[PDB]
């Protein structure tokens, strides 16, 4: 029998009672008086489940069809971590298939790649590419450069005077007091040179920085609040407009990151016998050098790409964020990568390829790779947590291995097209 | 307990146990999926630094007849993706509960507060200005002179129509639109375009490019067709043609947010929101050197509603495409009018990761889970609707945040 | 005197004197030298050295073709060295190309790669597409009503009206199919048309100002904020130039035999090849082109444009060009190479083209003037020398590169 | 002995340094060339005869018949840092210089306007190529360490007294390796000054990498004369910035606009218009226009007008009521100079000398040559002005 609203709010408001008494009816009616906010059901109910499940069920009345959320699963889940860091109005999660890609023998070492993906054929080319690799001695990488961005823009009164402030920070010593502003939030925060960019009275600065194994967006805008701050100091006229104006430049394509980097720039490199692009992956060298020419290079530039030379490296990427707990909406800078084929050995018969990618943003600490299951797939690669001894070696690791696995992506997919 | 080689082989699965198995694929078929998926979980255990690595990778009670040959292989579990609810997004005389499956914190929570803006305000109102999945394959013929005539060829009335024929021929959703080509010397890119009833049209629009392709073979026997994909689709890579011609969906939203709301809602005044818009979104990405990158967040809706939705979540690369524009509205000129311009949104409700019951549990929440039988193409044009409004409620939220400071 | 100047101007200007119209302060004055001599006086005192001018040319030249068409406030003129390269071999024609420069060697070497494509067989090319742009912005109230304007131009009935009104301005004005793009509530519409021998931005500007008036018939609450939003794009980068065309889009090709490689070119094609492919396409893609992908088509574009009286300002767009190498022949050691250039805006008649000199360039070409019988012919075999030219500057530039 | 010998003797033999004079020996050229012409009366207008063809000879052209003349105008004052400049400008398109004179009227009647130059450094970006990815890396790293740019720097800047190697940056593709060399020059454009500097640094940096091959000296990593994104981002040769404020009577009398309708057309043009079209640093109305226009008038290299006309143009409401026009333009690539190439031409270095800038300026290195890039960001700024008042009136 549903009880009066009144005498509902009495019960949950005793310490030696709480909601456990009051049944799942009697707290849909006090959501809808707005006496319990919906947001809030994991907090003030028994447990995190029963939260979700409440507003499944307020949700499910609003919509056109009751029955909508059937065959979303929400039970025997690990709400907890998901509470207050990386998901809110919650009504369950969906269920993304993850196969596995390997061995991929990059750098002396073997590697299991998980990937997350609804897309048929992906896993098994993904897969064959890494065969292909595997008999040809191995795959090499090295990261050439680490640092996260933000890139705010100020407002000076004039031109004159953003010009001031740019000359400014371009001296040591102005420098040397906007870095150590920007070191003193956090353990990690180690401030490289600036790169500033001036359009009228507006100054638009990047800065960057290492940030251990974490991705490091926060870290590095909490810098840039400290660092902005301080060069208000000496600049009282400077508006800070925005933490972020896009000159950092996050999830949107970029020149800039392209050319400057943004998190890991990474370069991957092997060398396939002739034997192997025969039996493997079904073509001949000659054939995947022309299809990468007139694909990845001349088909790119016709349609006017900025670091889109290459096939599908954003089918690796995005399916190893998806498993791996990264930000997938990074997938957009995350995947410029530019495949490179020539001949190679004595007869010039084997198939050199390289990928490089400027712009890996990714990380083993924080965000979704706080939740268990996606510190699973980290674990599969020997790159969860934080690494103690070598601060950063863990996120690096993860980047030449995404940076591995889109070669073999490459490999496989101009194959079947350079076949046909 | 573990039996001989010999014994195992005469036997073959129901009668032998876990561990038999194990060994018969070291020495150089099962009844469930289900089992099958636990036996690769253990011969891939051994071979980790970490053998209790899949410990919390879940696999259980998963349907896997849905996934096997078609989405997946080598599976080894499933990845839970936290869905979350913003809405209600009122949008065209209408209301959407938006599911978004994310791992980023407040991420849900900001576009809900921009739903809730968008609603005190009167509502959001969306148009599909095209509709059309790209393929663009490169072909080579001996000279330059060659493929310049094949290009005159296909821009006459009479070619086109032979082309137009044998691509139309390869499914009852496809009408091929005018040809765009380009020449590089003897390459020859061809942008062939079309509707895809409610797929998103890939795998479609890629069969009836071989068709054409084909039947272009006959008139032109020299020619040779190096790749299905000469990068000029283009498909998951930034480019230009995608945001000048579009890809797939192009859509454009906006919504009037009066003062008020402005400012109780999103804490901010209208003139601080244009303010960060002309210079962030605009001004700020020029200087970065953006093409199709003037927005704030998009990407971040664009994801969240891909992987909820059985999407390409690869695909955001292209369908994150956003200009996101702001000004002074009303009598008093303090309202602020925004929209939100998507011209190259890569979208589906059949096919790929909608086959899949969880998927289409959330395709359900916004009405748009299927093809539509009475108006082929409705659902996947009303899910790109969703999104560009989703997008936009994103746009509010943050644009506000970063204002406000 | 000072009273007495007045009433002689009212009668003329020659009984007056140079010193006389100075103490007072185009078509007061009698003859059109004798307006500049007084320009430069006046001009003189203003600067800090008035002997600027002294080198600065300006007799003898004729301003009747310049005053009121070309050039305002003339105080002069400015000699540009003009050299030949070739014979240039195309289309089983030779053409003597005039360039004005003042880059040291560059005449020279681009007189090298004319060299190489004349004695391996000749160059080829095509124009594949012609039609300059204008690309207005307009303003409805709202975005659905934007996308109203957008689906009316696609229909034939809507795109039949605005071209009845742009084909009406011109003889040579024939409107192709719109390119449409909406940003919100703006509306962005690329016109395009041939224009005969002209570049034909005048042309152009002429059927868009009246396809847009009667675009407004239709639609009244539609404002016209710009006849170009820079969506042509003229004089700006852009990647709508590179995708569907500016002007002419041309394409050259010619396979260098293997002995012209090694004695011409003093290079091999094998190291050609690898040149191109890590500069021209690799490195341009690692600097973040957009159209960019050769070695210094710019420098006979500019050349080029500076002698035959065409708007030098064009070669932002007119330059886009992509430059492809390969291995040709049975033994697999010629080079083939080619040069695609999308967006060449030119014209053999009106603007610069109106003066002597420059039809004295353009006349070297055969390409002077309109032509009668097959209009736009002479502005077409313009822009396929332009093209050719360009691909013999990329060949001897990159074979000096590859030998080092 | 070719003195003795007649025109007609020599053309009839066949069928540079011989001649001895300068004159005569283009005047036999264009014989010879009249022959192989369809029209041999082609050349009849074209002009060669009492021209210093002394300084063109060996240096700045080569195969010469003649020359060009190019009108040039002349628009000003253009108030500019408390100076004024009368900006000779050559061109053959009707109303440009016209217009770009009432852009200045506009700047000087509303108190002038203001420049600084932000960078200094001419570019040269080479592509080398190492055996492997990973040996390429190793350069990179080798070249980022304090003593490793310490030994590059000290070979580019003996190779010239201009040559100062500033930071560089650098992009790996596989294993080849780009290099991005900067430096100022002097007054010189520094092409040439910067090129041999790179030239010496790569030797040196073979003496470390024996196994580095030297593809290209130019890599397109400048880049010249094509257009870029690096020069928009990193700039090249002079990075310059200019801004004015017209108060709202002169943007109504002057340019007949008013500034709500110059900052709608700016936003919807120059922003929106450019980001709809694909641009990578066009974000203006024609600076194209008066950038090329000054480089002809001034001996510069005009194929450079490729990178050099890059520019943002930004337009707001100013002043007590808001109805003043505050303009800005940003050009962060003007690649200029007043030594060297065209401008050791005569009639060239009289336009330089109307503004004040000819030749190297002795006290102060590299003084002329920047404030000619600031003269053309505000000349461009003035051209702005004008068009987009031209193009809100209708
Ligand atoms: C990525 C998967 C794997 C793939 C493959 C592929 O790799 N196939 C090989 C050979 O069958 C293979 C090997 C082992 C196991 C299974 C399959 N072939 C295609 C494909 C389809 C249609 C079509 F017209 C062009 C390519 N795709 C889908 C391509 C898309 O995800 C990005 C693509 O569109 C990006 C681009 O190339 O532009
Ligand atoms: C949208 C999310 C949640 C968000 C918000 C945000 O929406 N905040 C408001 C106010 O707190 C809010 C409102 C209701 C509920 C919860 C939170 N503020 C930031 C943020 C953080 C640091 C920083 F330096 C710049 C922005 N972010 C991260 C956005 C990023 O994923 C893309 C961003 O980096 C793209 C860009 O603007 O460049
Ligand atoms: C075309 C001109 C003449 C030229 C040549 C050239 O053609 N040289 C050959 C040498 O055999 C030649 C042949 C016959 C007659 C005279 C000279 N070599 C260079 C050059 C200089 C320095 C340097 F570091 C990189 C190249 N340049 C300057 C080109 C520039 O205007 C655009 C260039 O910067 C575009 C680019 O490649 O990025
Ligand atoms: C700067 C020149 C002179 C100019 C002017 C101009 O300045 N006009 C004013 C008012 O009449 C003026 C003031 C004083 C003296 C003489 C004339 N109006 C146009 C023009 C023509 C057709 C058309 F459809 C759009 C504008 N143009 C041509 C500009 C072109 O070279 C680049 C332009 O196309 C770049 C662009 O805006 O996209």
Redesign the interface.
Same mark, same amino acid.
């Not at 909508?68 to 699963?73: D, I, K, N, R």
């Given at each position: 029998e549903p009880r009066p609203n009144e005498e509902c709010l009495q019960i949950l408001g005793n310490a030696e009672k709480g909601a456990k008494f009051l049944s799942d009816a009697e707290i849909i009616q006090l959501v809808n008086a707005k006496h319990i906010p919906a947001?809030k059901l994991e907090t003030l109910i028994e447990t995190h489940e029963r939260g979700v499940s409440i507003?499944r069920q307020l949700?499910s009345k609003?919509?056109?069809?009751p029955s909508?959320?059937?065959?979303?699963?929400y039970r025997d $889940?690990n709400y907890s971590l998901?509470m207050?860091? *990386?998901?809110?109005?919650?009504?369950?999660?969906?269920?993304?298939?993850?196969?596995?890609?390997g061995?991929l023998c990059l750098d002396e070492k073997?590697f299991?790649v998980?990937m997350?993906?609804?897309?048929?054929? =992906?896993?098994?080319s993904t897969?064959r590419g890494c065969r292909a690799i595997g008999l040809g001695g191995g795959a090499?990488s090295?990261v050439?450069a680490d640092g996260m961005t933000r !890139?705010p823009?100020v407002?000076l009164p004039?031109?004159?005077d953003?010009?001031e402030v740019?000359?400014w920070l371009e001296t040591s010593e102005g420098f040397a007091v906007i870095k150590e502003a920007f070191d003193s939030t956090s353990r990690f925060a180690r401030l490289q #040179?600036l790169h500033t960019?001036?359009?009228?009275?507006?100054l $638009?600065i990047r800065f960057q920085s290492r940030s251990g194994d974490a991705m490091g967006m926060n870290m590095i805008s909490k810098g840039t609040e400290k660092a902005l701050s301080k060069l208000h100091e000496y600049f009282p006229e400077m508006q800070? =407009?925005?933490?972020?104006?896009?000159? *950092?430049?996050? #999830?949107?394509?970029?020149?800039?990151?392209?050319?400057?980097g943004r998190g890991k720039?990474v370069? *991957?490199?092997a060398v396939i016998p002739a034997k192997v692009v025969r039996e493997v992956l079904k073509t001949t060298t000659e054939a995947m050098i022309?299809?990468n020419?007139?694909?990845?290079?001349? !088909?790119?530039?016709?349609?006017?790409?900025?670091? !889109?030379?290459?096939?599908?490296?954003?089918?690796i990427?995005?399916?190893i964020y998806?498993?791996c707990?990264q930000?997938?909406?990074?997938?957009?800078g995350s995947?410029?990568c530019?495949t =490179?084929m020539e001949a190679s050995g004595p007869t010039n018969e084997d198939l050199y390829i390289?990928?490089?990618m400027?712009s890996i943003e990714i990380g083993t600490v924080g965000?979704?790779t706080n939740?268990?299951?996606?510190?699973? *797939?980290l674990?599969?690669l !020997?790159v969860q947590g934080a690494c103690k001894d070598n601060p950063g070696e863990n996120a690096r690791q993860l980047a030449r291995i995404v940076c591995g696995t889109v070669m073999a992506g490459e490999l496989s997919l101009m194959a079947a097209?350079?076949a046909?």
């Open positions: 947001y507003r949700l609003k919509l056109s069809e909508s959320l059937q065959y979303l699963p $889940y998901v207050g860091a *990386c998901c809110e109005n919650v009504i369950g999660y969906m269920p993304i298939p993850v196969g596995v890609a061995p073997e299991q998980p997350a993906t609804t897309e048929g054929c =992906l896993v098994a897969n090499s090295r050439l !890139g823009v407002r004039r031109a004159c953003s010009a740019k000359a #040179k960019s001036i359009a009228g009275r507006n $638009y800070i =407009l925005a933490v972020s104006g896009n000159y *950092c430049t996050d #999830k949107k394509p970029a020149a800039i990151n392209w050319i400057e720039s370069v *991957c490199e022309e299809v020419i007139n694909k990845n290079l001349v !088909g790119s530039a016709m349609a006017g790409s900025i670091g !889109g030379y290459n096939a599908h490296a954003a089918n990427v995005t399916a998806i498993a707990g930000d997938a909406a990074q997938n957009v995947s410029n530019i =490179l390289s990928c490089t400027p965000g979704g939740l268990l299951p996606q510190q699973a *797939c674990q599969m !020997g097209l350079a046909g």
